[PDB]
Design a protein around this ligand. Structure first.
Ligand SMILES: O=c1[nH]nc([C@H]2CCCN(c3ncnc4[nH]ccc34)C2)o1
Length: 167
């Protein structure tokens, strides 16, 4: 039993809710919240900008130190950093950005990072300002993630479309 509330069950292990991931993290305080990161951990907009803003920029400060030490992530890769006031940990995962021409096949590699964590609160990777089709992202999620994932979809219109079109 866990504290996630109001989710629709899509499969054995994937759940979905129309929710602001920032507000959901603040309420549940999950072990892991996933950030829709880029390779530079520059949290300017989208989910990343919103999560970082909610940490009062502490996520960005920590991220800048991480990059200065380790260099950029790979597209499809991830790193575990603090969850600050939102979660125990933040898993920063880099989905391909279609608006940069990155290979959509890397979306499966990106979701594989979730399998290293038993339970996660997450957005749909590569959706929103990353330019991919969110229906496709949900399909890859369901077909790749085997651990328990609670997906937060900000847009109510998109949430209803994802549910109604789910196979
Ligand atoms: O307006 C739109 N069009 N496409 C989106 C998705 C992609 C980027 C943001 N993403 C989120 N998912 C869950 N929580 C969130 N908080 C803030 C953002 C957010 C949804 O948003």
């Amino acid at each position: 039993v866990n504290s996630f509330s109001g989710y629709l069950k899509l499969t054995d292990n994937v759940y979905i809710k129309n929710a602001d991931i920032v507000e959901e993290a603040k309420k549940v305080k999950p072990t892991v919240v996933v950030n829709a990161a880029n390779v530079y951990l520059k949290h300017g907009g989208g989910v990343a900008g919103a999560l970082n803003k909610a940490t009062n920029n502490a996520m960005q400060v920590e991220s800048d130190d991480y990059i200065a030490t380790n260099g950029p992530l790979k597209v499809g890769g991830s790193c575990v950093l603090s969850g600050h006031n939102l979660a125990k940990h933040c898993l920063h995962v880099v989905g391909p950005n279609v608006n940069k021409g990155e290979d959509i096949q890397l979306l499966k590699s990106a979701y594989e990072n979730f399998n290293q964590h038993e339970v996660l609160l997450a957005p749909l990777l590569s959706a929103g300002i990353f330019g991919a089709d969110p229906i496709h992202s949900l399909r890859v999620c369901v077909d790749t993630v085997r651990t328990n994932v609670y997906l937060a979809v900000f847009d109510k219109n998109l949430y209803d479309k994802l549910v109604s079109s789910f196979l």
